[PDB]
């Protein structure tokens, strides 16, 4: 029936919106066995793994595949409620769902759909999905496992991506106040001061020159993901086609837009342009939803092309 559309290319060329430094307000850990713990017992330390590590080791016999079902955002609301933290923001969602909105102009092939509801008591707009274990995905999980060390002093080989640590963050993008929950791979040193600049994101990739358009898009997606949670470092394990780790590359998240500056072609999406469009997208979602009573359900869909489409559910 009635559809509302947002076009990436209808966005006027504006100045980049102000974005505050993400502020951690809560954190939690998920045990191997899915017990949610209100502590940082699953937060690991980064330690550089040996070069020429074989990322195939343990696949599939030591691989406990991830659950492969979306998590309801009510988990985060309940964390904040349990800790007595009030939600006076515009959006509550998983970091990765803002990454999808922000990076949609970058990859028209990644099709996705989210569900949105305004909570009647707090007025916040909650967003979730209701809709990853092949060898290449394992290389990524295995790179994280071999590059991290659990807490030992104040506390096997199995690769268990379901065991996680999560930071819940307040971040303002232009006039939209967001509460975002995201997974944190490990920390660079002791957990303090706001800790997110101490956090580290781990990635594995084949190495291409920055002249390569696909390499630049990938780095922009790495940047966007970490930027939204205030992650200070991205550490990339470059691997060859055999899955052997060949080179380690430590990046500061804020350096990725600087590093890419000499390589952008005149048509390319840039960090600043992505932030402008995202800010207009979020204002459009908020305006559209707030034009409905709370507890009205919406879907937000991207199916290629250059628009988002918002539908009221029947
Ligand atoms: C059908 C479906 C299945 C899903 N299955 C999982 C799952 O098994 N485990 C999980 O943590 N989240 C899964 N999700 C996504 C969750 O609902 C939720 O959005 C996410 O866990 C929230 O954490 P974020 O940190 O915001 O997620 P993101 O920023 O999107 O990604 C951060 C990290 O979460 C992991 N991750 C994210 N998405 C998936 C996925 N689809 N499958 C496996 N790992 C993923 C992975 O370690 C990733 O690091 P890396 O990017 O280096 O690969 C699934 C979503 C859908 C629609």
Author numbering: 0 to 130, 138 to 161, 172 to 208, 231 to 352
Sentences from the paper on this structure:
The DXO/Rai1 family of proteins consists of mammalian DXO and fungal Rai1 and Dxo1. DXO enzymes are capable of removing the entire cap structure by hydrolyzing the phosphodiester linkage between the first and second encoded nucleotides, releasing GpppN from unmethylated capped RNA (GpppN-RNA), and they can release the intact NAD+ from NAD+-capped RNA. A single active site is used for all the DXO/Rai1 hydrolytic activities, which are mediated by binding of the scissile phosphate to two divalent cations (magnesium or manganese) that are coordinated by conserved acidic residues. The eukaryotic DXO/Rai1 decapping enzymes can eliminate diverse 5′ modifications from RNA, and here we show two additional activities for them: release of FAD and dpCoA caps from RNA (deFADding and deCoAping).
Modeling of FADP into the active site of free SpRai1 based on the mDXO complex indicated that FADP would clash with residues 65–71 (β4-αA loop) of SpRai1. Therefore, to understand how SpRai1 functions as a deFADding enzyme, we determined the crystal structure of the equivalent triple mutant of SpRai1, E150S/E199Q/E239Q, in complex with FADP at 1.9 Å resolution. Good-quality electron density was observed for FADP in the SpRai1 complex, and it is also in a folded conformation. The structure shows that the backbone amide bonds for residues Lys66 and Ser67 flip by 180° to avoid the steric clashes between their carbonyls and flavin, which leads to a small conformational change for the β4-αA loop. This conformational change also enables a hydrogen bond to be formed between the Ser67 backbone amide group and the C4 carbonyl oxygen of flavin. Pro65 and Pro69 in this loop have hydrophobic interactions with the flavin. The flavin and the ribitol groups also make other direct and water-mediated interactions with SpRai1, including Trp93 and Glu128 which are conserved in DXO (Trp131 and Glu164). Residues 131–137, equivalent to helix αC of mDXO, are still disordered in the FADP complex. The bound conformation and position of FADP in SpRai1 are highly similar to those in mDXO, indicating that the two enzymes have a conserved mechanism of recognizing this cap and catalyzing the deFADding reaction. However, loop 65–71 of SpRai1, which contains residues that are not conserved in DXO, makes more intimate contacts to flavin.
